[PDB]
Design a protein around this ligand. Structure first.
Ligand SMILES: *[C@@H]1O[C@H](CO[C@@H]2O[C@@H](C)[C@@H](O)[C@@H](O)[C@@H]2O)[C@@H](O[C@@H]2O[C@H](CO)[C@@H](O)[C@H](O)[C@H]2NC(C)=O)[C@H](O)[C@H]1NC(C)=O
Ligand SMILES: *[C@@H]1O[C@H](CO[C@@H]2O[C@@H](C)[C@@H](O)[C@@H](O)[C@@H]2O)[C@@H](O[C@@H]2O[C@H](CO)[C@@H](O)[C@H](O)[C@H]2NC(C)=O)[C@H](O)[C@H]1NC(C)=O
Ligand SMILES: *[C@@H]1O[C@H](CO[C@@H]2O[C@@H](C)[C@@H](O)[C@@H](O)[C@@H]2O)[C@@H](O[C@@H]2O[C@H](CO)[C@@H](O)[C@H](O)[C@H]2NC(C)=O)[C@H](O)[C@H]1NC(C)=O
Ligand SMILES: O=C(NC[C@H](O)CNCC1CCCCC1)C(c1ccccc1)c1ccccc1
Ligand SMILES: *[C@@H]1O[C@H](CO[C@@H]2O[C@@H](C)[C@@H](O)[C@@H](O)[C@@H]2O)[C@@H](O)[C@H](O)[C@H]1NC(C)=O
Ligand SMILES: *[C@@H]1O[C@H](CO)[C@@H](O)[C@H](O)[C@H]1NC(C)=O
Ligand SMILES: *[C@@H]1O[C@H](CO)[C@@H](O)[C@H](O)[C@H]1NC(C)=O
Ligand SMILES: [Cl-]
Ligand SMILES: [Cl-]
Ligand SMILES: [Cl-]
Ligand SMILES: [Cl-]
Ligand SMILES: [Cl-]
Ligand SMILES: [Cl-]
Ligand SMILES: [Cl-]
Ligand SMILES: [Cl-]
Ligand SMILES: [Cl-]
Ligand SMILES: [Cl-]
Ligand SMILES: [Cl-]
Ligand SMILES: [Cl-]
Ligand SMILES: [Cl-]
Ligand code: NA
Ligand code: NA
Length: 527
């Protein structure tokens, strides 16, 4: 029996057998008053002390969210849907500590993605027990509010100030500072890592002054705040808030009377209405996301990045080879996970209208012009691969690259990776390649489980990635120093070296997607 005295009370964990060893898991520790009733849409409130032994032996409720129902019964989509009950009462976190108890272990804090509308820390691919067992770090992950319940914005109004889900994250980082030493953890050695909207979240903690003292280093997988989907403007946010008010019958004149009316609405009413607050949205539609609230985020983050206004520390940043492919089968005409998705020039043009709905004809033409000059015009995959590249370069790869160049220009070490391995267990079709989100299982060491039917070469690749991530968190330097590994050079703004992650030869390359990213980063924002 394993009871720890946290600052708010005693929690009891459970014992886990992992690779002939043991991990102690604390699942579902609460870190805030449940944001219910009059607390819905507010910032999270501190938790009152309990005098019993809290039983932290099962994953807690997931936060209210809409489910991906586009492919019922398909593991490729459903692996991402919540695996606990949905509830507003969802502000809980998990802790995996090595056995026996460490003395001063580095802590890894995971922040999941999901487009800021979905996600949960209880997902199988976020199980931190392998990192605890293998690298003797402490893995922490938290649930945070998402969708309108987490990011509805009436800027300046504390009844719904925006960025509540980011403050949920922040309060959990504070829990680790106040409590993790009781678990064997070193609160002075905390590395945030996250993927997609989780990665964008991590980058925003690098800008928020309130999070500066709550972590040491940061890892950003397939995401950063300067990606076009990551920050809702004050314009759209209030137009989206106001729409939601109309759809729910809550249009009032006193701006607080609106919030009051959305608080007697059942969570389902709010959820089913989030889809329509945007007139013509995209598959990547972040209906309710981070805004410039003037509390968590003091200015527009592009300006903060550009003028060096962020925590000075090391970062590890990276992207996958085919970020853009997953989105094509959520709306692009002619695409389907159940065929090879050979699309015509006309279908490609229609696809740009889907992903760039309010962009001018000239802007859409300029995308076509940059991506439709190929070596071979007979190649029938040409338009199919071009549209995936368009979506991935615009939405993920070029913003991550630009974040890395700009962040490192202020003098910190940065490490950039290009993940190009397609999991042998990937349930999506082959033409979709190295998809968005399918490095995560390698980062968490799932292929280290010999029973799970990954190949040997994947166990090795995961084993090395896990080492490099752990060395990064522990030492600010993501090297594998023992097994004659390729040395990972720092990403400098001149040479822009990066490391490729794959099962064969890990190489050092320069200036990833240079041509494509000059278009997206220099020319396209003019249109
Ligand atoms: C746990 O270790 C810390 C030292 O942390 C080091 O620095 C961090 C930035 C991180 O990178 C870790 O890997 C390092 O191990 C100890 O902190 C010291 O505390 C004493 C007070 O007793 C203080 O005088 C020292 O200045 C601190 N050292 C540093 C480097 O800041 C802490 O005591 C250790 N905890 C336990 C329980 O042993
Ligand atoms: C700001 O919001 C308006 C209002 O959104 C419309 O009504 C909501 C209830 C929701 O159902 C949305 O999908 C609706 O679009 C939007 O502009 C509207 O555009 C549509 C047609 O595209 C049409 O209803 C009206 O022309 C507009 N509604 C008005 C004027 O009330 C759009 O999101 C934003 N419009 C502007 C001008 O900023
Ligand atoms: C690939 O499939 C898409 C999607 O069509 C559906 O899925 C298929 C697997 C099959 O079950 C079809 O019967 C389904 O309709 C095809 O796109 C459709 O194309 C037809 C005619 O070209 C058109 O009428 C539909 O509107 C299209 N639907 C969508 C969602 O785009 C596409 O033609 C298939 N491509 C190849 C190369 O086989
Ligand atoms: O992740 C989103 N929404 C939550 C959805 O319940 C689940 N996602 C679909 C999965 C399919 C394969 C890998 C990716 C996840 C959304 C998004 C928006 C902005 C940035 C990143 C992601 C999105 C993702 C894929 C396709 C369409 C939309
Ligand atoms: C919390 O859970 C306890 C679980 O029962 C046993 O507790 C320890 C001693 C281990 O042996 C464990 O494996 C067992 O399952 C309950 O005894 C206790 O009443 C519970 N308390 C609350 C408040 O739910
Ligand atoms: C809106 O209602 C709140 C609560 O009663 C009140 O404090 C505020 O002054 C009202 N605003 C206006 C403009 O009347
Ligand atoms: C290095 O190789 C040895 C070979 O036995 C293996 O046990 C070990 O896990 C490897 N280490 C890393 C970090 O890959
Ligand atoms: Cl719960
Ligand atoms: Cl519910
Ligand atoms: Cl599961
Ligand atoms: Cl899986
Ligand atoms: Cl490539
Ligand atoms: Cl052509
Ligand atoms: Cl061009
Ligand atoms: Cl998988
Ligand atoms: Cl093919
Ligand atoms: Cl070299
Ligand atoms: Cl390239
Ligand atoms: Cl250059
Ligand atoms: Cl150009
Ligand atoms: Na390339
Ligand atoms: Na141009």
């Amino acid at each position: 029996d394993i009871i720890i005295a946290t600052k708010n009370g005693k929690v009891r964990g459970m014992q886990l057998t992992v690779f002939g060893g043991t991990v102690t898991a604390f699942l579902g520790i609460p870190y805030a008053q449940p944001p219910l009733g009059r607390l819905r849409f507010k910032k999270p409130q501190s938790l009152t002390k309990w005098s019993d032994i809290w039983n932290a032996t099962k994953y807690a409720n997931s936060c209210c969210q809409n489910i991906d129902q586009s492919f019922p019964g398909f593991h490729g989509s459903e692996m991402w849907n919540p695996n606990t009950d949905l509830s507003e009462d969802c502000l809980y976190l998990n802790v995996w500590i090595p056995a026996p108890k460490p003395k001063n272990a580095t802590v890894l804090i995971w922040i999941y993605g999901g487009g800021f509308q979905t996600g949960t820390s209880s997902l199988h691919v976020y199980d931190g027990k392998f990192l605890a067992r293998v690298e003797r770090v402490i893995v922490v992950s938290m649930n945070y509010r998402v969708g309108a319940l987490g990011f509805l914005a009436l800027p300046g109004n504390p009844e719904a100030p925006g960025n509540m889900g980011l403050f949920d994250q922040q309060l959990a980082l504070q829990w680790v500072q106040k409590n993790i030493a009781a678990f064997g953890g070193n609160p002075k050695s905390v590395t945030l890592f996250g993927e997609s909207a989780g990665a964008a979240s991590v980058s925003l903690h690098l800008l928020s002054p309130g999070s500066h003292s709550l972590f040491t280093r940061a890892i950003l997988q397939s995401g950063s705040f300067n990606a076009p989907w990551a920050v809702t403007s004050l314009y759209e946010a209030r137009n989206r808030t106001l729409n939601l008010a109309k759809l729910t019958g809550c249009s009032r004149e006193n701006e607080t009377e609106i919030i009051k009316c959305l608080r007697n609405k059942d969570p389902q009413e709010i959820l089913l209405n989030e889809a329509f607050v945007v007139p013509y949205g995209t598959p990547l539609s972040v209906n309710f996301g981070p805004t410039v609230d003037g509390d968590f985020l003091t200015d527009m983050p592009d300006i903060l990045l550009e003028l060096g206004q962020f925590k000075k520390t090391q970062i590890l940043v990276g992207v996958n080879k085919d970020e853009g492919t997953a989105f094509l089968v959520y709306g692009a005409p002619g695409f389907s996970k159940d065929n090879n998705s050979i699309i015509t020039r006309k279908e490609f043009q229609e696809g740009l209208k889907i992903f760039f709905p309010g962009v001018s004809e000239f802007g859409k033409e300029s995308i076509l012009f940059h991506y439709t000059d190929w070596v071979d015009d007979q190649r029938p995959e040409n338009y199919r691969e071009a549209l995936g590249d368009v979506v991935g370069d615009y939405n993920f790869i070029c913003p991550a690259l630009e974040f890395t160049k700009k962040f490192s220009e202020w003098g910190n070490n940065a490490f950039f990776y290009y993940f190009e391995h397609r999991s042998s267990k990937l349930p999506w079709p082959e033409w979709m390649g190295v998809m968005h989100g399918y490095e995560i299982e390698f980062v968490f060491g799932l292929p280290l489980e010999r029973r799970d039917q990954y190949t040997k070469a994947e166990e090795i690749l995961s084993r090395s990635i896990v080492k490099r991530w752990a060395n990064f968190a522990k030492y600010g330097n993501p090297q594998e120093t023992q097994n004659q590994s390729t040395s990972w050079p720092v990403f400098k703004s001149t040479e822009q070296k990066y490391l490729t992650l794959n099962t064969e030869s890990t190489r050092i390359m320069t200036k990833l997607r240079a041509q494509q990213c000059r278009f997206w980063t220099s020319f396209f924002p003019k249109v």
